């Protein structure tokens, strides 16, 4: 046993844990599949990297639907603001943008690698490229070695798996790190994608009515509800995408998954600051100021043209009919459609192409204030392998570097 603990993965959770483990003292080995360290961290945040957010604690949880509120824990030792001077003292200044998202002042995510690396090499950490793991070896409840694809065999008795998700596989997550969680007795939380675009097959998706059509500032709700508030949302030519879209995904997918349904509905509110009164007298003090205008005319601006129009025939109005000589039920059936327009959606993008990966390995069964097994002595894990997932907006990377210092530093300090 050359290594005192050994690192599988060099993502921001595998490279805080491996410095964690190295401060304790450890002789530390990291070894990832990759040629390069950090990839998917290399083009986080639109190549700039959104490192953390600055937001307080709950809000931070909040923002972290899958299990935020497992981080309690750990954000007591190590949180957000302790992310931020650690940074700092690296020599990568961040700065706040817009709701509390933190990126380095270079505008690099090279930059936040860089830094990592550098106190990786400081704290003489032994880091092995190109060298992908093919499974872990346990005994007696106990961790015993790594085993590389090539056979090579590294004994160690205590192994921390940071090797992240299953999406873009391309930067080296392609979901390893399950099949040696339930070898150490561990259970995998289904998998499924997030933020992705939703698929629809309803008529007017499949005739391109609206391909390409944005709504603005809308609320997208997935009925049964969960809400998307104020987010910009577009029709394509096979469903919906943007913001509001992307944030529903997650949730479209579930709930398919649990009631075996082949759509679930979505609701559109496209006026969420206006209230159905207030739509509908809006709407009738404008056709008496010209009530021999055409409809199509007198009520143009509420909505983009294009699914004015779309809804003006769903409701049976012609465009050209005079504003005095349309009915008010007809008028409180457009209002209607203004706030909630349904859309039968039925499933969404794959995993391969998600910005996080869902599910992952329970955190049931990992003490929250070690990330230690619960089940095999001397394993640990950290970062998206984890069954714990954020929205956008540094979430994700907030709970990888968070994840992975406590498991490293749990591991350098078990290992002595
Ligand atoms: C396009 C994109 C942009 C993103 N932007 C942000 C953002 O700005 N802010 C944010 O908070 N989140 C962002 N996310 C998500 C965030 O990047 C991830 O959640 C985070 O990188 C996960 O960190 P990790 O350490 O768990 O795993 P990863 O960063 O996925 O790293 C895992 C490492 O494990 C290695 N590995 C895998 N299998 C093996 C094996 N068998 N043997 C050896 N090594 C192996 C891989 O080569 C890889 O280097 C973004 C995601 C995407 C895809
Ligand atoms: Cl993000």
Redesign the pocket.
């Known amino acids: 046993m050359h290594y005192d603990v050994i690192v ?9 844990a491996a410095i964690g483990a190295a401060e304790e003292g450890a002789n530390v080995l990291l ?4 040629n ?6 290399a ?4 190549g ?6 600055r937001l307080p604690l709950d809000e931070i949880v909040k923002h972290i639907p899958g299990n935020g509120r497992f981080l309690y824990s750990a954000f007591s030792i190590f949180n957000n603001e302790d992310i931020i001077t650690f940074f700092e003292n690296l020599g990568v200044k961040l700065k706040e943008e817009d709701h509390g ?1 933190m ?1 380095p002042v270079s505008n690099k ?1 090279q930059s936040v690698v860089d830094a990592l690396l550098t106190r990786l090499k400081d704290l003489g950490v032994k880091i092995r490229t190109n ?4 499974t872990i070896e346990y005994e007696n409840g106990q961790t015993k070695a790594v085993i ?2 090539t056979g090579e065999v590294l004994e160690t008795n205590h192994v921390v798996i ?4 299953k ?2 596989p391309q ?7 399950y099949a040696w969680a339930e070898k150490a007795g561990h259970t995998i939380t289904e998998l499924f994608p997030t933020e992705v675009p939703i698929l629809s097959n309803e008529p007017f998706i499949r005739d391109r009515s609206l391909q390409g059509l944005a709504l603005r500032d809308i609320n997208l709700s997935v009925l049964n509800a969960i809400i998307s508030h104020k987010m910009d949302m577009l029709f394509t030519h096979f469903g919906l995408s943007g913001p509001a879209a992307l944030r529903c995904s997650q949730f479209v997918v579930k709930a398919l998954k649990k009631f075996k349904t082949n759509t679930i509905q979505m609701s559109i509110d496209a006026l969420p600051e206006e209230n159905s009164e207030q739509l509908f007298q809006r709407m009738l003090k404008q056709m008496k100021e010209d009530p021999k205008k055409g409809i199509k005319n007198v009520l143009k601006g509420y909505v983009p043209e294009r699914y004015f129009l779309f809804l003006l025939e769903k409701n049976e109005i012609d465009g050209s009919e005079q504003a005095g000589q349309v009915s008010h039920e007809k008028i409180r059936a457009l209002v209607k459609d203004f706030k909630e327009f349904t859309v039968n959606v039925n499933g969404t993008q794959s995993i391969e192409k ?3 990966t869902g599910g992952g390995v329970s955190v049931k069964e990992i003490n929250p204030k070690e990330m230690s097994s619960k089940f095999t002595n001397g394993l640990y894990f ?5 069954d714990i ?2 929205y ?9 570097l968070v ?2 210092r406590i498991a490293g530093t749990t591991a350098g300090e078990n290992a002595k």
Do not use: W
Request: with cysteine; charged share 15%; hydrophobic share 30%.
């Open positions: 599988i993965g060099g993502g921001p959770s595998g490279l805080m070894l990832d599949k990759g390069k360290l950090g990839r998917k961290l083009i986080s945040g639109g700039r990297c959104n490192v953390t957010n998202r990126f995510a060298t992908p793991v093919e590389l694809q940071a090797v992240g998700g999406s873009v930067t080296g997550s392609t979901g390893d790190g998600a910005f996080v950290c970062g998206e392998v984890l997932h954020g956008t907006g540094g979430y994700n990377i907030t709970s990888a994840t992975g």
